[PDB]
């Protein structure tokens, strides 16, 4: 009952325990942020939520079944952008975004790049894009994806004040329809406090 | 989704202009040329040495292209294929492996007419050379993939991880060179082609799953 | 005024080494013509894209 | 007074028609003087008529690599873009000339050797020259950003030209270590010497025309966005 | 910031990148073992091809190892040495090449006594081979440094690097194989070693500067 | 007066001119922030100031002489931490910082890492650290270097609110003694407007 759910997630690296007993249920239209300091298990928790890393002791469930059980209807509606954006650095911003789209209509890939602020830099190889223009290539998928679950690991890493505002406004309307956005930002969000469900690592 | 898109992407990241398509051909030509400059210019000895020359060149090309297969993806995008792409990870591995073959196996097979007369082989020797390159070069990317996936992405990895990359290709090299050598004496090499075909049939079935499991182990 | 052959390609075009002589001629003319044609066609294609980007 | 704006495009365009006409005329006269009028030697018979067609390519492959080295030197110390761009304009032409020399010498020694390929000093030296040419071509095309390919290509050309005499002398000594010397000797004969000179000059003019055309194309590729290309 | 500090840092980085420095060693062993397996009980023919295959294996192993010379520096810290460290960039290149040789060319010299027993050479043949690797592998590293410096921005990890610096090693291959072959006849090898030392001295002087220029080109 | 000086710096990458005729002199005590969006030539200008990239036109003079002429004495007083941290992932945090200290290290490097916020992670490889803890290894040099010139390219890329506070206080007493901090940031600095010299790419 409900989308992505943690069931007593436990994880410890080296000798410190990052978290234990993490049990939260996420429903539709819910904007959440994984609050934590620098060094906590925030990226670790996000990778557990995407299924990239198996929990030490616990399980994550999508629609009621474990992520490894389905693995096919979960990746279908799931968009995760981590610390590494996941874009080929020699390909241009278009053919790199063309790969991640459902069909690559090239009329929506150009529209998404323009909506992400990367207008006029579609055909330049992304290794020549500066530092946040490279980050905007991965973030341009936010305007293409039909996924109902967004997993973002510091999406404002090198984005300017206008790009952060446009990203925040894009994430706001996605959660207004049916979407779920799990976020980890060290920069405070410029959105109302009642619209964010902060869950800590305890 | 759409396995073939992954295949075409791995092709695109390899060749970025039409002029780079011939680069593996030039690499193979230079590697072939390296041997007369060392052994000597006599054509009879180059013929008896030819199986070793060809398969050393094939192994070198496969080793060079195997590092590009997975290592470059950990820095940016080895994920978004485990996490995304509702096709199973073995399918992604298979697409990457056939792209790796097409950037390494095809250039040596396409150029095999030309390098079968620089060394001095006849038609039958070239026929067996091509039939073992077609049947053994794709394997070089299958059984080398699980070892490469671990080595290029498992931090704090020891020397023993290198036992699963090069020394696993010893039986393949031995049997392929033996097939070519027996073809040199104009002998029925049918028994050696069965061994190479049983390796290709068996390895292509287990390598994508083994590589997928290795990638799952290494990412965590 | 004084040719090196008694008559035409019945004597010319075959000095006993016709295959080797003409293979060299063909195999040198073809790459030169390929270079010339590629340069001209690439110039034309570049000028086409200059006007193409003007849209 | 060296101006070096995009006016080099106009200067290249001015010389291309006359240079091409001259190259065509001199090649035609040199290949009709040879290949049909000049006598043939006693030993090789009419297979010797490949001098007019193989020797100029072999000469001008080395010549084009030397010109590329000079251009790379000029573009390295003085920080010149066109000198680095001239290397890329000349590299395919030199590679084609090396290929022509290789395939016309193999077709020439085949009646004598009995095989289409012999690992002698001549073939090996031109083979490694072609390896240098294709390495330069691949390095220039491997860079997404221009004006950085041309500096890398120029440095590679300088490295290769420094090592070129070493490689040539090593290959020449490697041949004597195994077989000993060339086939018999070098001889041109007075009657077959003038058409060979005309053919060499013709290949020089053809390479000059081709490098002007390629330089013009590369100038367009570089400045494909400047307002000067409003044409 | 010091010369020896950079040397030790590169040594420490290479040691923790294990299974990447052992792969060239495995390739060298497989190359030098495959040919004696192909050619049967023919001691005369083995002696004729032993120097050539040994030095071709050394060259190809050096090309396999040359990938990591500057590769894991452009992503993080190829700068901080150009931009900092008042030590001149040619000196930084020299230290890095020395540290690369300590893990690339030095193991081949340590493994040389076992190669002599495997290939059935004499004590004098081993002496000449060891002197050839000692004077030839630093030349290999110095010749391959400019190529990897030029191709570091491209991060091909493939055939491109093997067509830039492989033609440049032809004189070294020729004279090394000539020295080793003349050792088989129990002939004096003083002149060959003198030529190899001359090549090492010539390459070790200009290669740091060429590599520094190439690195400056690639960093921008 | 005039530790660094820009002398009509020009950079025209493709059809876009990032800046033209830039001239600014920086004496001791200057806390200078380069302002711009994600496409403006901020990293390009910083790499020009460090001498990594040579300008299309103009030149940078350290103390009155061009950078290439005094490259030996310029690198003595200079600190670059760019978008790439400049540290080895397979080496530990202490070993990476051990490389950047002139003398007395393995005892001052430990204290410097404590100031940067990496107490207890000194003997852990960098690749096993978090995204923001990996940035703190390079930022630990701020507590070790005696360089007078600091040129920082987004030092708050993945740093927490407490770590950003310590970095701001760190490069605030550096400029009080007579040092120079050249900065490019997207997060707004928590210091008075009078303490920062905003210069844009005009
Ligand atoms: C005989 C068939 C034709 C001969 C080959 C002709 C090649 C001509 C190349 C050419 O005109 O293109 C130039 C090319 C790239 O030019 P560029 O303008 O920079 O391209 C822009 C974006 N890629 O630059 C190049 O890549 C130039 C490469 C030149 C290499 C010459 C080698 C010829 C090899 C011929 C292969 C066919 C025969 C196979 C072997 C025969 C011998 C047994
Ligand atoms: C098979 C491949 C061959 C290659 C790659 C080759 C290469 C060359 C080169 C590089 C030159 C330049 C002049 C020089 O180096 O001194 C040259 C010239 C010449 N070649 Fe060859 N050669 C080949 C075969 C032959 C053969 C079989 C002949 C038979 C006669 C021949 C006859 C000549 C002559 C006479 C010259 C004139 C040299 C001069 O006057 O400077 N070549 N060739
Ligand atoms: N090789 C290259 N590397 C970086 N930028 C390049 C290159 N070639 C061209 N450029 C262009 O030069 C401009 C320089 O921008 P710069 O890198 O200073 O942006 P930035 O302000 O650092 O961005 P961010 O704030 O995201 O770090 C970029 O817009 C880019 O498009
Ligand atoms: N391969 C690894 N990558 C990252 N952290 C690791 C790894 N292995 C162990 N760890 C440890 O696990 C802990 C979890 O760190 P995590 O990556 O969750 O930090 P984070 O909260 O994402 O930091 P930031 O907010 O800067 O990204 C870290 O303290 C780290 O020491
Ligand atoms: Mg994190
Ligand atoms: Mg930047």
Residue numbers in the entry:
A (entry chain A), F (entry chain E): -1 to 200
B (entry chain B), E (entry chain F): 1 to 220
C (entry chain D): 1 to 55
D (entry chain C): 7 to 237
What does the publication say?
The cytochrome c maturation system I, consisting of eight membrane proteins (CcmABCDEFGH), results in the attachment of heme to cysteine residues of cytochrome c proteins. CcmABCD represents an ABC transporter complex using the energy of ATP hydrolysis for the transfer of heme from one binding partner (CcmC) to another (CcmE). Our cryo-EM structures reveal that CcmA2B2 form a homodimer which is an ABC transporter analog.
The cryo-EM structures of CcmABCD in complex with ATP and heme clearly reveal a ferrous heme in the binding site. When both CcmA are bound with ATPs, CcmABs form the “full-closed” conformation which is very similar in the apoCcmABCD. Heme in the closed NBD state has P-His1 liganded to the heme iron at a distance of 2.8 Å and the bond between N(δ) of P-His1 and the heme iron is perpendicular to the heme ring. H184C (P-His2), which is located right before the flexible loop and was previously proposed to coordinate with the heme iron together with H60C, is too distant from the heme to coordinate with the heme. In both conformations with heme, P-His2 is not a ligand and the entire P-His2 loop is located near the CcmC:B interface. CcmC has a hydrophobic tryptophan-rich motif (WWD domain) of which at least two tryptophan residues W114C and W119C are in close contact with the heme in both heme-bound conformations. When CcmA2B2 is in the closed NBD conformation, the CcmC P-His1 is enabled as an axial ligand to the heme, which, with P-His2 liganding, facilitates the formation of holoCcmE.
